[PDB]
Write a protein that binds this ligand. Sequence first.
Ligand SMILES: O=C1CCN(c2cnc3cc(CNC(=O)[C@@H]4Cc5ccccc5CN4S(=O)(=O)Cc4ccccc4)ccn23)C(=O)N1
Ligand SMILES: Nc1ncnc2c1ncn2[C@@H]1O[C@H](COP(=O)(O)OP(=O)(O)O)[C@@H](O)[C@H]1O
Ligand SMILES: [Mg+2]
Ligand SMILES: [Zn+2]
Lengths: 366, 804, 281
Amino acid sequence: RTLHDDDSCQVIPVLPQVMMILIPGQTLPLQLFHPQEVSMVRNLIQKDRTFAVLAYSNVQEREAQFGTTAEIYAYREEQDFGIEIVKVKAIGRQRFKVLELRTQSDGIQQAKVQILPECVLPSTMSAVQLESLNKCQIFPSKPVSREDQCSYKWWQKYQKRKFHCANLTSWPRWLYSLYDAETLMDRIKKQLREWDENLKDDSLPSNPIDFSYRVAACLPIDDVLRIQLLKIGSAIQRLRCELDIMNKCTSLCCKQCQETEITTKNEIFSLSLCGPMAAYVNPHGYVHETLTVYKACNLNLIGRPSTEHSWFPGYAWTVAQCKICASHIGWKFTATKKDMSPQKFWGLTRSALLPTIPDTEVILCL
Amino acid sequence: MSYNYVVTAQKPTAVNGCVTGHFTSAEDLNLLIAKNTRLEIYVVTAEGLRPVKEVGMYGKIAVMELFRPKGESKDLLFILTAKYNACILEYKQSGESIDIITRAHGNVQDRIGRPSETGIIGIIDPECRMIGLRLYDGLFKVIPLDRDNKELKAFNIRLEELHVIDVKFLYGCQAPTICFVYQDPQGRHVKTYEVSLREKEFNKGPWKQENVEAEASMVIAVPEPFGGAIIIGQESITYHNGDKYLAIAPPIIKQSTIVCHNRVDPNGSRYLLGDMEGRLFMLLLEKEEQMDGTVTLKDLRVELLGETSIAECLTYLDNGVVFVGSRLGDSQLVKLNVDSNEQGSYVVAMETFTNLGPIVDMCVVDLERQGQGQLVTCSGAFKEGSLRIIRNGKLHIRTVPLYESPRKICYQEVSQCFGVLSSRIEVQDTSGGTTALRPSASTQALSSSVSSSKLFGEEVEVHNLLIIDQHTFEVLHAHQFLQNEYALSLVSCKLGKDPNTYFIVGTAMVYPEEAEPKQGRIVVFQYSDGKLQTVAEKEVKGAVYSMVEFNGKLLASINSTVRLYEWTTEKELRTECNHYNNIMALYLKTKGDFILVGDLMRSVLLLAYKPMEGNFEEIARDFNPNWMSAVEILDDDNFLGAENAFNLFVCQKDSAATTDEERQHLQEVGLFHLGEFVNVFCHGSLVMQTPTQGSVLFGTVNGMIGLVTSLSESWYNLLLDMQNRLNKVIKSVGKIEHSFWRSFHTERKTEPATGFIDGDLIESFLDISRPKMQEVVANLQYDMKREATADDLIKVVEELTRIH
Amino acid sequence: KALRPDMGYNTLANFRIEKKIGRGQFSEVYRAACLLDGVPVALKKVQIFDLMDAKARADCIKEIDLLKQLNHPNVIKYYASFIEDNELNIVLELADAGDLSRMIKHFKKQKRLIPERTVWKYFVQLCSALEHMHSRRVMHRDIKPANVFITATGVVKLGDLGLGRFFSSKTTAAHSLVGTPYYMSPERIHENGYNFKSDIWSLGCLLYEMAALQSPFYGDKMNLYSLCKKIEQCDYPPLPSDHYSEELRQLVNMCINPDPEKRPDVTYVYDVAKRMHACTA
Ligand SMILES: O=C1CCN(c2cnc3cc(CNC(=O)[C@@H]4Cc5ccccc5CN4S(=O)(=O)Cc4ccccc4)ccn23)C(=O)N1
Ligand SMILES: Nc1ncnc2c1ncn2[C@@H]1O[C@H](COP(=O)(O)OP(=O)(O)O)[C@@H](O)[C@H]1O
Ligand SMILES: [Mg+2]
Ligand SMILES: [Zn+2]
């Protein structure tokens, strides 16, 4: 929990067969059965509780260059069967650059990695803020205007005062608002409250570094874009890229087909306290980051509905796959009772979706 | 490897601070001015100001205050630079030799710190016993002014208040006290703390009043007999002294925020208050009769004296003459004609001093066709707007006041006129429409128009294209743009098989609901027979930030796209090719078929137009995240830029690279802390056309015009060793190393300078005396390599001065 | 219990066999549940190393890689294939609702012929499946009522794909039927290779079994000498005229022809089936 220093090189164990891209702040539930993996975690509890999770760019090959450290915040040991099943919940803390990968004789990998720094740049107007305007730069915090506000009125006055010194430079006030941490966070909050209706600033972070990594976990994005967001070091550039994904990549197609649209941004809504996307676990320890959508297209139901291990109690799940390539995309959830609203919804796994630009001919910018 | 030479053609003219006292002598009244890196010393006379000495300091003067320790005959000056270089200087003249000695020096940057939002504040105790510097939130630094404190040993007292707005040492205090306005989620409050040098704890002060104005931003220590402090927000002026708390809300000050102040009388009876619109008010403190209580303020009064330049700082001198240290426009000595009946007091400007800052955009022209280049700049902002014509012949400068913000500028040789994009602020009128605040270049044009295309009190920004004559500088035409249309770029060039030269304007439809510009247009205009004509119009789905003539075709940046238009025989902008990139294309510069694209976060790339392909090929990328202001192509391999805390950098294309990764990556081969914020770069020279090649001029916010030129490795290594020898001989002001000042600086890191030669330090070789010249050229080699003589290197430095 | 997420559908560890549901002459089918997502699959294990030689194993594996690439709704999709414990494991789309053989057997019990409207409804879906396979130059080699699966919603899905092509019959027998399709074509009597025209003969013979509720050479199955001679001469009882249309019966006679060149291509069979299905529905 004390966090590692920036640019410091750490030798930490990479947990085997964890082929995923962990993001700082993201929770990682894991179920371990091998005594070698369990004893490694048992020894990590006696130390800083930090292990490594590699971001493998290639699935078949071990092309891993970046990763994220994971601190074990909760330990749980079960002896229900002859196998000591140990379930642990970890949380991502810092990104890293892979310097060396040492496979030990016991199969556990040891990674000497460099902790990457978070690029915290000052305000653009700090270089041109006049000494006479330094005194009136701070905005007055008051419940009469900063809360129960018009939003249209307050953000206009915020831009005028913060970026008043834009007259000295070769660019307008509104251009500086496009590279402003608070304005970009506000624009993401607007688009995020549409999906997560019962959301408030008490849950989302205030800091832009912590906010950007939280947004990357919430966004239904494939492993390609998830690596690209972690490659971006500056939070302003990361928020600009995340917000461009939200505006341009509004269509969510099947990853195998690429041209078979399953759902769109407007269909995203929430039925869990975590948000629209939540990391659920099946009876065999597999984690599925399922997106909660109102309606889904090009999906066929295989098998009969079931109630065992239903993630949404009082809803019968049915296996759903792509009508074109038969690849598993998710599960359709139908209500058992008549008054239970929504009447029907779909839980689509993240690994099976691919965010695409609507059918027309653009790159995602930072 | 790239090697460059940066020399200052025009020193920074903008004034960021001014102070008065007795620096040269107790019997001489002085006016010391800080023009960013320079310090000017003047003697107050009935003839205005007599120049005494201008010194070149290696640092941005952030704090500048005068104080006289007990025993000292004359005042000493404290200067703290942007890089926290604190120092105390003394004026010393023996006959004719004027030299500014360094009594005390040091770097007061803490090992770990949270820089405050209200900048760096530096205040001195009235009895000259300590220097309170509020650099970081929660830590108030105290430097005791002891006899043997040459290295300025400092200690921080733990302050509980983090979001402190402004602090000043109060007067009428037996024990030193500091009054301050701080903000917390509950509101803005006033609190005093007694500063203890012995216990190093903030003891309970004499008083602390809560619930002050929401915009309370300024604090003024009132001297004896009045005592206490004056707090000024936007709509009210208050005075606090424990038992007394006066508060006045005159309607003459509610229209603008008061941002600067200065004391007129040493006792504190009269004060000057300047606002954002350049208005000057007089704050009077009426004293009531004494039984034994001379510490009684009867009432406060505010009287609008008149309109002056947009004042960054003010300074009362004598006979009603006030120096107005303006940062946006010309600084000026104004006379206050209060000597009538005290009812009708009016201002009369008496002497204006040229200020070219902020230089927003510029262009190199040759109006007289004499070979020597002339630089016309878009200087000033708001009513201080102007066009300055700089020519070499020591640089002669002509001013053309526009009374509105000039944004961009270009030159059209065929029609003998300049294209100038400009903006004026009109308030939302009582009738529903808009009304101009004052007459300006766009409203007082010989001919004016509004675009015919059709695709309360709130301030509205109105953009217009001005066609200004090259000889008389009269506004011949003022074409106003559409409602909610921001004019961003402007060029004057010939395209396709058309012989006429057109003024092309790129715009962005800015609406408050739209966060990013989703619409804009490129308008082509022809100026013929004294009038501008709308010729072509091409609507685009984005903002047109930059445009450039690229091999007879119009290259334009639209949000995150670099599109190329070819001018058809039907006079229409037909698209040829596009390049969609991961960057918001803000900056566009071209040389032949190569294109340099840049972002506000230093995310840059280089494309190349291939006629065989008929599309752009991405050559190289370099995504180091850091703020930017301007870029320029030096040559096919070297590219110059300006980043975050007043730095200059050069990225080079690795041509000798073997792999695609190394060829597609630009290596950072140059770094230099310039100390100025560069807004524009322009190829050209003021001198008629050597060890140099290329001539890239630059305009800055502080009004400084510089020049960058490429040098060979032999000239670079010669001037680098000569620079180190000059640095170790020249007495720097405030004992600040040249290596530290020019070392690249950001809030994250401070790395040494590379690939750049400080031309100002190289030119100082001719200013040093002959015994010191022999000390510098000793053991230095010059090319067969032989021992360099003083005479041979004097000719080399003289050739470097001949370029500007 | 082992779990290897990185492998996915290419390992036994990520599947739990629920119950055995079938066993072909050269295969073992099991109703299995994917432990990663709960997709019901049919794990088909084939002992390729036991009787198939290195060349016949390679030709089968290479074809299985292109069969994964197939994309048609009326075809059982090959999800994944892998060699583990010297056994070829093929993961298939489960179609346990029933098959054309079960429906024909049920109509035989009720003593009623399948209506012609219902015959074309299912024949047109199978014709689309064979048309797509032949467009990609892929031969089924064992078109029979058992391999024509039908879902509860009435969707037809051709699957399994004939493995018999490896054929050997090492015994010293006079006649052989091991490693031959359900409807053996005359060219297959000479023990020669397979062709696209054999699938047309099997498709035509299947349309006969849909109408008469029996194979065109049903009855001769007991005495193989008469069966082998009757296939060459195409001596089968023709379909009755009073029950089915002239177009249905002439298409059967065109497809059931001894000369492979005289049999029409799947393009014309699928075109005729679409015309008949449009009229009847
Ligand atoms: O709401 C949701 C969305 C879907 N989902 C979900 C996500 N990934 C899975 C994976 C499975 C795999 N398991 C099975 O298919 C089967 C059948 C079955 C059917 C329903 C419930 C549990 C089980 C258990 N088995 S079994 O093999 O263990 C039992 C068994 C043993 C021997 C013989 C025969 C059967 C299931 C659900 N998955 C949820 O977890 N909840
Ligand atoms: N894809 C499948 N889905 C469901 N059942 C299948 C599948 N393939 C074969 N079967 C079943 O397996 C049995 C036949 O096995 P199979 O290997 O197909 O042999 P054959 O093709 O020689 O009949 C039947 O009971 C059939 O229903
Ligand atoms: Mg088969
Ligand atoms: Zn698909």
